[PDB]
Design a protein around this ligand. Structure first.
Ligand code: HEM
Ligand code: HEM
Ligand code: HEM
Ligand code: HEM
Ligand code: FE
Ligand code: FE
Ligand code: FE
Ligand code: FE
Ligand code: FE
Ligand code: FE
Ligand code: FE
Ligand code: FE
Ligand code: K
Ligand code: K
Lengths: 154, 154, 154, 154, 154, 154, 155
């Protein structure tokens, strides 16, 4: 296994480990505030990131690298719904950037299986961005109090 | 079966007895107003309190005491959804305090089974607090009329 | 809502609230004593009286008065099976009486729907009387010990 | 069959005929404006009143009088959700009153089956009253636009 | 594992061993006599004590202590029903006492899991006590012959 | 019932009571050590002796003797798998022998039903001997470590 | 509004579960890579138990109005064979067991019995795990390392 691929993989893994904690905490927060629809959705984003992290891990061990679950980067914890979303969105725009750089590297050293995995993960983070923007947009279109009312119940 | 524990059990029973009538009256008031989702939850709060009552009466009789269903304390009856919610919270903060005081005493006299009964009751009373705090929070985040709107239907 | 009708209702409601606790304690006393068939029967009487209180509370609120769950008259707790029965009977003989008086009044002011409610409650309370007198009768016919023996199991 | 009781039945009938049409039109109006949930409720209100009319007609016929389906009094047709609710409420306050006198007369000449019929009808108009009052108050408590909103979908 | 806890556990275990044999013998005695409902209830008490023994054994072994099933204390074998109940009752009073001591010692060295295990055993022994006291109480109220009569058939 | 027969019976019962505790202990020991196929088979051996005891108790009693659950003989506990198996085997050899003497004596006084019951027990204790001897021979044929390995998992 | 020191023990305990979650997950995946699929699966389920404890701790903290700290990750004890891996996990549980015990005493002190109760259940579950670990380790001595890994190839 090419040595920089494993580094790019562990960099993505770093990004997924942050997201898991950022999204989990954010979910629980929304739950404790009684905004249980945002709590459910955010809870699902978090489980998603865990499964990306799992795939990455298996891939690294396969290529004979060392998965680093030790270094946890910086959690972006908002203190209200709108910040909370904007943070996740910032965290995604970042992982989106790193994912692209990795896929480039993989393509360059003919590691097409790793490229494929990254490509799948990227499709999913992009779906997440779509959800996030839409969410922010809807707040402008219906107003914050309404938007929040609509995520009280499931 | 120690006599001071039983004074405690009667005191807790006295609190449940107030909650029952209060919650139930609040339920019927929310229903008369068309706020049926609030009505229905309060009713279930009322019923949960009826089950704790039963538990306390059973325990007391077993311990060879005399359950007091006669002295009924002060109902805190609000006259709108915010006061009503606040009164229930004042009641559970009170009821929670006497629960801890009764627990310390069971521990002291080694009445572990009554300790456990009281702790179950406690945890439930603490979930009720979570509910009430969150509701009050929601009214702030989404505005009174939206919160009430989201509580018309079940 | 005629002002005196509401008094009549709140007064009946007052009697239902005394019946609830009396019968419930009676229930659990019998249960503690190992007379599980009386205890079960009495527990259902206490539930019947709870459903009556509910009907009454709603009607009062519909009539735009204030249900009074704060006042609690005198429980008649007995100390043996025969006394407990005689108590529940005294209490129902007294309930029956206030019910008739309330019906007379509803008729006079033409609140026929409130009268219908009470006549339903009435009938149910006369069935309670019928059960009570039959039990007292049975005790004389089979003897106290036989009668209790037939009420150990469900 | 008493001459005056039949008169009273035909009067109660006249009131039902009016209600049938007023509620049916209000139903279709709310349906036309996209307020499909008021539409549906109000449609059921209309249907109850056709069942009352049918009951009344059979009774008149059994008592050998002539049912009068020819005289239709004044429809109270609102022009917005609030005028429409108030029209129905005025209609039902008037109907209730006629019912009360009708019952008094039946009682007087011992037509207890006609009184029983009219009392059932009465109860049902009182529930229509409870429904209306509650809506009117919901409107105050959630605001006209939130109220209309919650009544768009079924 | 703390050495005094393990001695407590082995002591309790010793109780349960007594109770298993006592309750079982009392069970077959009652069947032999044709009092099958007492026989069957007493059999299930015996079984219950076996489950408690097992759990104790698993715990001791886990705390690397050595389970003592070698020393069997003194049985209290009654000679008629009244006496058999009272024995079981004395045994359960004694065992209760020891359970409470074990629980103090556990809490004190911070063995909160063995505490929990004991608190659960205790509550079950406290239920056996209620059955016991109750049966003794019933022999008074319905008389001895009647009570045995009521316990011939299952 | 012959006075000697009962002594023989109470002796066999004295053997089953040992076996029960010994096997039960051994069982929990193998489960502690993670050897769950031996733990579970040993536990079933326990249950089997519990059933034998129960039959002896019933029979003794029917014969109007006093079952003796008081004297517990000498548990033979091993401290490794090989010893445990060898102990259970020693104990079963000793029981086998007591059973044969009892059978002889029953035949002599013509207590053919007790002979039959002991004969059913005997065939069961010889099945167990078969198992043990086989286990021990399997330890020679495939090696200790292999044998234990083969008994780790259900 | 919960007691400040309780919360601190709570975040502390949460902090222990975040380590267990990662340590256990990596061990699970390593054993999988090696084809020790039975150990893989078991460790995976141990990782999941700890994600669940963490979830309850996060809910409690918030309920008591504190700030859950998912930001500081303590030190993962990664072993490099099956015997070290089990022994690391064991160390990790003796450390967790301890912090848990102190946090419970504190709760009893300030009468927060609902938080005590939550910790007492986590505690039990970690003691269940120590039971498994010690058992596996002892099994390695009784049947031999090679046999033992053999019985943990398949599920
Ligand atoms: C001594 C005080 C009371 C006690 C101990 C008590 C106890 C109980 C219990 C144990 C239940 C069964 C819960 C279940 O469904 O599992 C119940 C049900 C109920 N209670 Fe109470 N209660 C009390 C007072 C009241 C009061 C003041 C009301 C007011 C109306 C009330 C209304 C009801 C109603 C409507 C039910 C539903 C039963 C059914 O519909 O099947 N109770 N109660
Ligand atoms: C404006 C005049 C009326 C309109 C627009 C109207 C409309 C309707 C409609 C749409 C139905 C549903 C039937 C189906 O789809 O199966 C219905 C049912 C019915 N109508 Fe009418 N109706 C009117 C007047 C009356 C009158 C004067 C009566 C006198 C009795 C009446 C008696 C009934 C009865 C008994 C039913 C069946 C209700 C049931 O399900 O039991 N209607 N009506
Ligand atoms: C006087 C001595 C004992 C007798 C006569 C006895 C008898 C019995 C009997 C007849 C059963 C029912 C089994 C079946 O029908 O399948 C049983 C179950 C059981 N016994 Fe015992 N036993 C004795 C001692 C013990 C001891 C000392 C232990 C543990 C130390 C024990 C543990 C158990 C357990 C765990 C069960 C299973 C209960 C269940 O079904 O959940 N027994 N016993
Ligand atoms: C922030 C710390 C974490 C928390 C609070 C957390 C929480 C959870 C929860 C509550 C579940 C649902 C459990 C169930 O009911 O089955 C879950 C599932 C799962 N978690 Fe985590 N987790 C965390 C970190 C991680 C990490 C680091 C990984 C991998 C390295 C991971 C991988 C998984 C996987 C694979 C599942 C199963 C998903 C599925 O199949 O539905 N989690 N987690
Ligand atoms: Fe949404
Ligand atoms: Fe809500
Ligand atoms: Fe509505
Ligand atoms: Fe009866
Ligand atoms: Fe009985
Ligand atoms: Fe629409
Ligand atoms: Fe028989
Ligand atoms: Fe295994
Ligand atoms: K809205
Ligand atoms: K009899």
């Amino acid at each position: 296994g090419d040595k920089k691929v494993i580094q790019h993989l562990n960099k993505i893994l770093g990004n997924e480990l942050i997201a898991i904690n950022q999204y989990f905490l954010h979910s629980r927060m929304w739950n404790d505030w009684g905004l249980k629809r945002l709590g459910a959705h955010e809870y699902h984003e978090s489980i998603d990131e865990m499964k990306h992290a799992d795939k990455l891990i298996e891939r690294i061990l396969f290529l004979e690298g060392l998965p680093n679950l030790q270094d946890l980067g910086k959690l972006l914890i908002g203190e209200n719904t709108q910040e909370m979303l904007q943070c996740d969105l910032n965290l995604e725009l970042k992982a989106t950037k790193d994912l692209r750089e990795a896929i480039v590297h993989c393509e360059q050293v003919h590691d097409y299986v790793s490229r494929d995995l990254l490509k799948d993960i990227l499709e999913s983070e992009e779906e997440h961005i779509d959800y996030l923007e839409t969410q922010l947009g809807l707040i402008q279109k219906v107003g914050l109090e309404n938007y929040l009312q609509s995520h009280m119940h499931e």
